[PDB]
């Protein structure tokens, strides 16, 4: 429907990264998904997600959610509710938001476009 940016939890990315809020169940859009280099361990997917205001490229799917990408079209443009996530910090100090449970509210094909004009979140 109209006001597509109203579909997304504007400000949730800043809340996750600055406040470390994990109680929220924000609605985000997938902008892109790609594998990372994992050698002889399970494939792992990194996501560029949008909350309508910001994009952030430091999301990863928990391994348990891999089938959503492999089989069920979790893909660019879909709109998802994040039901459970955590944030982990790597040795270099960068943070990764690991999506543990998520629900696709609208398929990529039902949305079809990057909603709004989100800009990259800076650290
Ligand atoms: O394929 C490649 O050669 C590389 S080198 C490479 C280096 C990083 N990287 C960054 S940034 N900061 N620290 C590291 C790093 C990663 C793994 C490691 F043990 C040591 C250091 C991250 C990914 C990556 C990849 Cl992928
Ligand atoms: O400074 C750089 O350019 C490089 S090149 C470079 C290459 C590696 N590296 C080698 S060798 N073999 N596997 C890896 C590796 C890359 C990414 C990763 F997740 C784990 C391991 C690890 C760190 C690194 C860094 Cl740091
Ligand atoms: O977004 C990120 O986390 C990273 S980590 C990261 C690490 C590298 N990197 C380093 S250091 N040394 N070699 C590489 C490298 C990794 C993969 C590749 F095919 C070619 C080169 C290059 C880009 C990049 C990016 Cl981009
Ligand atoms: O293959 C690749 O493109 C990459 S990029 C890449 C980046 C990292 N890395 C380091 S160090 N510190 N934070 C991260 C990082 C990992 C996933 C992510 F969402 C954001 C950041 C570790 C491995 C890796 C690999 Cl492997
Ligand atoms: O700095 C560190 O402690 C770590 S942890 C770490 C983990 C990975 N890695 C591989 S393989 N498969 N999935 C991941 C992974 C990366 C980031 C993350 F959130 C969770 C998992 C790749 C590089 C790296 C580095 Cl570099």
UniProtKB/Swiss-Prot annotation:
In-chain residues carrying the UniProt-annotated modification N-acetylmethionine: 4
Entry protein name: Replication protein A 70 kDa DNA-binding subunit
Subunit organization: Component of the canonical replication protein A complex (RPA), a heterotrimer composed of RPA1, RPA2 and RPA3. Also a component of the aRPA, the alternative replication protein A complex, a trimeric complex similar to the replication protein A complex/RPA but where RPA1 and RPA3 are associated with RPA4 instead of RPA2. The DNA-binding activity may reside exclusively on the RPA1 subunit. Interacts with PRPF19; the PRP19-CDC5L complex is recruited to the sites of DNA repair where it ubiquitinates the replication protein A complex (RPA). Interacts with RIPK1.
Cellular compartments annotated: Nucleus; Nucleus, PML body
Full-protein residues shown: 1 to 120 of 616
Associated clinical condition: Pulmonary fibrosis, and/or bone marrow failure syndrome, telomere-related, 6: An autosomal dominant disease associated with shortened telomeres. Pulmonary fibrosis is the most common manifestation. Other manifestations include aplastic anemia due to bone marrow failure, hepatic fibrosis, and increased cancer risk, particularly myelodysplastic syndrome and acute myeloid leukemia. Phenotype, age at onset, and severity are determined by telomere length.
Family indicated by similarity: Belongs to the replication factor A protein 1 family.
Cystine pairs: none
Cross-link (Glycyl lysine isopeptide (Lys-Gly) (interchain with G-Cter in ubiquitin)): 25, 91
Task of the protein: As part of the heterotrimeric replication protein A complex (RPA/RP-A), binds and stabilizes single-stranded DNA intermediates that form during DNA replication or upon DNA stress. It prevents their reannealing and in parallel, recruits and activates different proteins and complexes involved in DNA metabolism. Thereby, it plays an essential role both in DNA replication and the cellular response to DNA damage. In the cellular response to DNA damage, the RPA complex controls DNA repair and DNA damage checkpoint activation.
Organism, scientific name: Homo sapiens (Human)
Post-translational modification: DNA damage-induced 'Lys-63'-linked polyubiquitination by PRPF19 mediates ATRIP recruitment to the RPA complex at sites of DNA damage and activation of ATR. Ubiquitinated by RFWD3 at stalled replication forks in response to DNA damage: ubiquitination by RFWD3 does not lead to degradation by the proteasome and promotes removal of the RPA complex from stalled replication forks, promoting homologous recombination. Sumoylation promotes recruitment of RAD51 to the DNA damage foci to initiate DNA repair through homologous recombination. Desumoylated by SENP6.
């Amino acid at each position: 429907g109209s006001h597509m940016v109203g579909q997304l939890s504007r400000g949730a990315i800043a809340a996750i990264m600055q406040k470390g809020d994990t109680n929220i169940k924000p609605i985000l859009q997938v902008i892109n998904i790609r594998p990372i280099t994992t050698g002889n361990s399970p494939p792992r997917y990194r996501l560029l997600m949008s909350d309508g205001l910001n994009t952030l490229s430091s999301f990863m799917l928990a391994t348990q959610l891999n089938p959503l990408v492999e089989e069920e079209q979790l893909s660019s443009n879909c709109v998802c509710q994040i039901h459970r996530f955590i944030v982990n910090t790597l040795k270099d100090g960068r943070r990764v938001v690991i999506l543990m449970e998520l629900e696709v509210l609208k398929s990529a094909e039902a949305v079809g476009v990057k909603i709004g004009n989100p800009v990259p979140y800076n650290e």
